[PDB]
Ligand binder design. Structure first.
Ligand SMILES: *C/C=C(C)/C=C/C=C(C)/C=C/C1=C(C)CCCC1(C)C
Ligand SMILES: CCCCCCCC/C=C\CCCCCCCC(=O)O
Ligand SMILES: CCCCCCCC/C=C\CCCCCCCC(=O)O
Ligand SMILES: CCCCCCCC/C=C\CCCCCCCC(=O)O
Ligand SMILES: CCCCCCCC/C=C\CCCCCCCC(=O)O
Ligand SMILES: CCCCCCCC/C=C\CCCCCCCC(=O)O
Ligand SMILES: CCCCCCCC/C=C\CCCCCCCC(=O)O
Ligand SMILES: CCCCCCCC/C=C\CCCCCCCC(=O)O
Ligand SMILES: [Cl-]
Ligand SMILES: [Cl-]
Length: 264
């Protein structure tokens, strides 16, 4: 049901996609160790924001690892090209993983925005419901990326509605709570918003690839877009969230944070 299954791949195409996924694994698990070691310099009220980056690194790293092995399982070099065998490859498992990873990305944002208690629980709940609506409708949509492009487009429009509303909740909370933030991170959090708008928008572009580039090179392009998007939305994002957490920790008087920033 996926466009990947439609084509044979050149050695170059096949190996490049393998390398993209493998590099993806390496970057996320390398970042994992960084987040782990810097977590001790985060104040208790923000430390979970850095823990969530560890959780996202392993979750994302595992899905990329799984995709890479699925890729090599599904294709074998036969008569001069990589051809589909008995096992299958699908990006559908990425969508399932987003059900977990996107709530984690959203939660760590709410934490460094200094949301607490009732507002935190209510905002997270609405955000996660919007996100799940987006992911589920998008998942249904990509079931038709070969059979019914029109249906892909309509489910995509519904998903985009959830996306836009989710982004509005995010922006509203960011620009409202920006003033509460310490150590100059009121400025930093503004860049985080724009990073999210940029990086998360790469995913619907990848979703539309079967509509505007239904060939083997389109398959490469989509994996390339996912790679840019994953690294930006999880790793670069996580680094900014952790920076914000440490900076606010230091400004709040947490001595390990002050000491850590002092060494650099
Ligand atoms: C780490 C993974 C992330 C941040 C994934 C984000 C995914 C999206 C923003 C997906 C958006 C979609 C649309 C807005 C329309 C087409 C269907 C989706 C689900 C690909
Ligand atoms: C930086 C270099 C990126 C690697 C290019 C791989 C594409 C190829 O070799 O076919
Ligand atoms: C934050 C951005 C992270 C970027 C990650 C992607 C790094 C590698 C990017 C690709 C370089 C272009 C490779 C040339 C493609 C050759 C075409 C092919 O062989 O199929
Ligand atoms: C392989 C990676 C090993 C990582 C172990 C690092 C332990 C961190 C110690 C700590 O800060 O609590
Ligand atoms: C095939 C029916 C798809 C139903 C989509 C359900 C939308 C999910 C909304 C928020 C949870
Ligand atoms: C909750 C939203 C559920 C779906 C809204 C209906 C619009 C998209 C469904 C398309 C159905 C189809 O194309 O057959
Ligand atoms: C051409 C790859 C880069 C596309 C970035 C633009 C999409 C996000 C816009 C906000
Ligand atoms: C080419 C540009 C690629 C961008 C690479 C991003 C790298 C890591 C981001 C680190 C986040 C630090 C937050 C900003 C620090 C500060 O505000 O002074
Ligand atoms: Cl604290
Ligand atoms: Cl993920």
């Amino acid at each position: 049901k996926n466009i990947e299954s439609l084509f044979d791949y050149s050695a170059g195409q096949f190996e490049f996609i393998d390398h993209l996924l493998t590099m993806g694994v390496g970057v996320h698990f390398a970042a994992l160790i960084f987040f782990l070691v810097v977590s001790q310099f985060v104040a208790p009220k923000y430390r979970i924001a850095t823990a969530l980056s560890c959780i996202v690194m392993v979750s994302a790293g595992l899905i990329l690892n799984s995709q890479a092995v699925m890729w090599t399982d599904a294709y074998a070099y036969v008569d001069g090209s990589y051809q589909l065998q008995d096992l299958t490859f699908s990006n559908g498992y990425r969508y399932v993983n987003w059900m977990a990873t996107i709530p984690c990305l959203l939660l760590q944002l709410l934490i460094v925005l200094n949301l607490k208690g009732k507002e935190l629980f209510s905002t997270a709940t609405w955000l996660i419901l919007a996100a799940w609506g987006m992911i589920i409708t998008g998942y249904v949509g990509q079931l038709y990326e070969v059979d019914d492009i029109a249906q892909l487009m309509i489910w995509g429009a519904v998903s985009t509605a959830f996306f836009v509303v989710m982004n509005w909740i995010v922006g509203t909370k960011i620009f409202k709570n920006r003033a509460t933030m310490l150590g100059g991170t009121d400025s930093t959090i503004t860049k985080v918003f724009w990073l999210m708008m940029f990086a998360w928008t790469l995913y619907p572009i990848a979703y539309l690839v079967p509509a505007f580039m239904n060939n083997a090179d389109g398959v490469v392009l989509r994996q390339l877009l996912f790679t840019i998007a994953d690294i930006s939305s999880k790793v670069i994002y996580g680094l900014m969230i952790t920076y914000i957490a440490i900076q606010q920790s230091a400004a709040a008087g947490y001595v390990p944070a002050q000491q850590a920033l002092g060494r650099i």
